[PDB]
Design a binder for this molecule. Structure first.
Ligand SMILES: Cc1csc2cc([C@H](C)Nc3ncnc(N)c3C#N)c(-c3ccccc3)c(=O)n12
Length: 827
């Protein structure tokens, strides 16, 4: 029933669908109807995909950014398996042919009709790629583990598909009437009002008269801009404050509605409390109408006037110094801005990637200059993904500009889209209207790729406790669910597990304040062994990675950290996945995990960029996902310990040492006996270089032995990223205990140590070349509202860390100075 689906969506998104209807908002109504149709169309297309296309939708290939290997292969309806010897260069089809030939000799009598499932995972190997190009195979080679695969027939894939079925004449100056305000404060009240096009003022800000602290102004506010010159995306921004400065509240609104109609007449603005003008703030009023200060205004009846259609703009806009033009096209002066604008045609024809620079010189407060700009924009060639990411910033607020950026981003691969998904979702917070090209783009890509769809859901769901985005995000999630009834239920199962983990964690938090850790742990186990917990916590797809299946919860192995927020350690097993099904999740409640996730995703991007240049620094890109209000999950890295635990140098252990500096190397020797030691020291060296460069570039501070871990393989990785971008200029960090392992436990080993410096330098030089990508992604991330990513000074930290203004030679000299200073500081 449509009624059952509505109650399921309401529970899933954390907001009743009845709340949307109660708003009596035609913009909400049209978004709902329009996006419902769009997502239902995509669902209809999905249910008729061919079986290979269904594999591409549900299990998109996990590929990496000659040698002999053994692979174990079984068929779906059998316990019997065959271990084959194949090559890393061999394709899945050859492996499937071997499997079918062996089955033919066992059962006594077409490879193209099959796909290879990774046992107990929603992950498949298919396509014309050598086995070593698959992430799963690549992972198996590095850990030494034997790949375990299942031959799955096209009819079984089709069965999965089927079961998952669903104007320019108005020359008068712009003016408003400030009628009256509301709510208490300590002084006089002043309303500051400015017209903005993104971060840029369209004219000077006008302030009304001072009135004593239900204030009544009934004052006319006149602006230094003609009504005809208001750009389509013009924002009227307000700041209510007190004066003897005391900030109280702010509110913004678009001057044109979602139907392009110029707004008239009376508007009640439910204001948001302050941390004066906030142009990047939402243009929707505070939903807490009970307690919020309100400002009533009047938009004079200029008479029904709409913004001119594209056909009108283009009609109007249709109507040796080349040297200095080039030198500034790779902050600028007035004569330089005039050069760019005069030669705008030369920008379009010979420097199309300089569109951003031309957009920034355009006079957005003059309709003639805007029409001239829009005329070139509508015939502008599509730009690279990198250029388009810059155009998504609040610095380019125009709707046509926004639409052009999306058009250039349509060529993003699913892998690239996934890499930038977090930032694209954040950009939604800058959107002026509910129905927009970004939302339609995201929803379309989410419905065409189940992994994208999973993370789009979680990035929206995890901010439902934020009133400024709850309506927009709730509406997007509802549209998504209309497009995928099956995935909605899959996501509901994840939500049921998370609700139980929150209840369990609250119980642990209370109990641990009264009894011992073994007693709270045994009480935790009794709670988990309740039928409703065993059921809710088992048989789900991991919110951290939908390809990871969390099958049977292993209660005996579950525990908690008897410190700070008391995070839970939840272990799982899967008889079908074998050793690969042994996975864990950390549930933590009380900390905002958004910065943690951003830091890990930036490190993961670094790893991708390094790997693209043939550099594998053996990183550990473990998952981190906010799921709710100060709630989220962390993927467990098994067979790892903290540096602090190893450094304790406890007795009656294989790691005990004569000197504390040897504890780490002795631990590595115990985990890697004989010939295996050399591979472990190399794993340590590579990862140490990766994380040294990563933490320096990102300005990750407060690094100690308690937030650095080591895998038994020798790989080093970081945890608990509470601080970044130097928000306590953090220098490069080198640790003597780590120098000791790199140097193979020798006091003097300049051969090994300088090979490590070379890894650092190469890693650093690679990231420098992609400096712009980091800058564009961090600029979009400013929309998130993270306290450590709030201004130009936070972005400046990255420019400085990557030394982007300098030449590669100058940058490497500067890096060598910082590395050498870190070497002297290391004892
Ligand atoms: C019980 C528990 C709940 S939460 C928690 C975290 C950690 C460590 C510090 N952190 C990570 N451990 C593995 N994978 C990760 N992704 C992280 C993180 N972040 C350990 C713990 C202590 C000592 C040795 C091995 C583990 C631990 O027992 N817990």
């Amino acid at each position: 029933v449509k009624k059952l689906i509505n109650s399921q969506i309401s529970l899933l998104i954390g907001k009743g669908l009845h709340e949307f209807d109660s708003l009596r908002d035609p913009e909400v109504n049209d978004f709902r109807t329009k996006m419902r149709q769009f997502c239902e169309e995509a669902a209809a297309h999905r249910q008729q995909l061919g079986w290979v296309e269904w594999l591409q939708y549900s299990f998109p290939l996990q590929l990496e950014p000659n040698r002999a290997l053994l692979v174990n292969v079984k068929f779906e309806g059998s316990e019997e398996s065959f271990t084959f010897q194949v090559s890393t260069k061999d394709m899945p089809l050859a492996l499937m042919a071997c499997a079918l030939r062996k089955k033919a000799t066992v059962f006594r009598q077409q490879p193209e009709e099959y796909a290879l499932q990774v046992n107990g995972r929603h992950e498949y190997l298919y396509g014309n790629y050598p086995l070593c190009h698959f992430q799963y195979i690549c992972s198996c080679l590095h850990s030494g583990l034997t790949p375990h695969l299942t031959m799955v027939h096209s009819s079984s894939i089709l069965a999965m598909r089927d079961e998952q079925s669903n104007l320019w004449s108005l020359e008068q100056p712009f003016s408003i009437e400030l009628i009256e305000g509301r709510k208490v404060n300590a002084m006089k009240l002043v309303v500051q009002a400015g017209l903005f096009h993104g971060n840029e003022m369209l004219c000077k800000t006008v302030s009304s008269s001072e009135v004593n602290v239900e204030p009544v102004w009934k004052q006319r506010l006149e602006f230094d801009i003609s009504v005809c010159d208001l750009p389509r995306m013009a924002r009227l921004c307000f700041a209510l404050y007190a004066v003897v400065d005391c900030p109280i509240a702010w509110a913004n609104l678009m001057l044109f509605d979602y139907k392009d109609q110029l707004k008239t007449g009376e508007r009640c603005l439910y204001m948001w409390p302050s941390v004066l003008l906030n142009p990047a703030g939402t243009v929707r009023g505070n939903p807490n109408t009970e307690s919020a200060a309100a400002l009533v205004i009047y938009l004079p009846e200029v008479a029904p006037v709409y913004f001119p259609a594209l056909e009108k703009i283009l009609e109007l806009g249709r109507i040796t110094e080349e040297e200095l033009r080039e030198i500034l096209e790779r902050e600028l002066y007035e004569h330089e801005k005039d050069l760019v604008w005069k030669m705008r045609h030369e920008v379009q024809e010979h420097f199309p990637e300089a569109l951003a620079r031309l957009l920034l010189v355009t006079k957005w407060n003059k309709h003639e200059d805007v029409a001239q700009m829009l005329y070139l924009l509508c015939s502008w060639p599509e730009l690279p993904v990198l250029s388009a990411l810059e155009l998504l910033d609040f610095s380019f607020p125009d709707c046509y500009v926004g639409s052009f950026a999306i058009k250039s981003l349509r060529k993003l691969t699913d892998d690239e889209l996934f890499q930038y998904l977090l930032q694209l979702v954040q950009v939604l917070k800058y959107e002026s209207y509910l129905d927009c090209e970004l939302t339609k783009f995201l929803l379309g890509r989410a419905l065409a790729n189940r992994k994208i769809g999973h993370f789009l859901f979680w990035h929206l769901r995890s901010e439902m406790h934020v009133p400024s985005v709850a309506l927009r995000f709730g509406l997007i999630m509802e549209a998504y669910c209309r497009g995928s009834t099956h995935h909605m239920k899959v996501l509901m199962k994840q939500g049921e597990a998370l609700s139980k983990l929150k209840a369990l964690n609250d119980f642990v938090k209370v109990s641990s304040q009264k009894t011992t850790k073994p007693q709270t742990k045994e009480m935790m186990h009794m709670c988990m062994r309740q039928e409703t917990y065993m059921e809710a916590l088992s048989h789900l797809q991991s919110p951290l990675d939908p390809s990871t299946l969390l099958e049977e919860v292993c209660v005996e192995q579950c525990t908690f950290m008897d410190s700070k927020m008391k995070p839970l350690w939840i272990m799982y097993s899967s008889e079908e996945a074998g050793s690969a099904g042994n996975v864990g999740i950390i549930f933590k409640n009380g900390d905002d995990l958004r910065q943690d996730m951003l830091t890990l995703q930036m490190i993961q991007l670094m790893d991708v960029l390094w790997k693209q240049e043939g550099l594998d620094l053996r990183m550990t890109p473990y998952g981190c996902l906010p799921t709710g209000d100060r709630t989220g999950l962390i993927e467990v890295v098994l067979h790892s310990d903290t540096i602090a635990n190893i450094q304790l140098n406890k007795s009656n252990m294989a790691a005990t040492a004569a000197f504390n500096k040897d504890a780490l190397l002795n631990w590595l020797k115990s985990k890697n006996p004989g010939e295996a030691l050399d591979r472990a020291i190399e794993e340590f060296t590579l990862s140490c270089a990766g994380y040294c460069v990563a933490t320096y570039v990102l300005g990750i501070g407060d690094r100690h032995s308690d937030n650095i871990m080591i895998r038994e393989s020798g790989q080093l990785f970081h945890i608990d990223f509470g601080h970044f971008l130097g928000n306590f200029r953090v220098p490069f960090i080198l640790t003597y205990d780590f120098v000791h392992v790199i140097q193979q436990g020798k006091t003097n080993n300049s051969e090994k140590f300088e090979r490590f410096r070379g890894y650092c330098e190469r890693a650093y030089t690679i990231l420098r070349r992609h400096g712009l990508l980091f800058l564009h992604l961090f600029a979009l991330m400013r929309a998130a509202g993270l306290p450590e990513l709030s201004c130009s000074k936070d972005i400046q930290y990255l420019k400085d860390s990557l030394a982007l203004g300098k030449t590669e030679e100058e940058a490497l000299k500067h890096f060598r100075v910082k590395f050498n200073e870190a070497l002297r500081e290391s004892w």
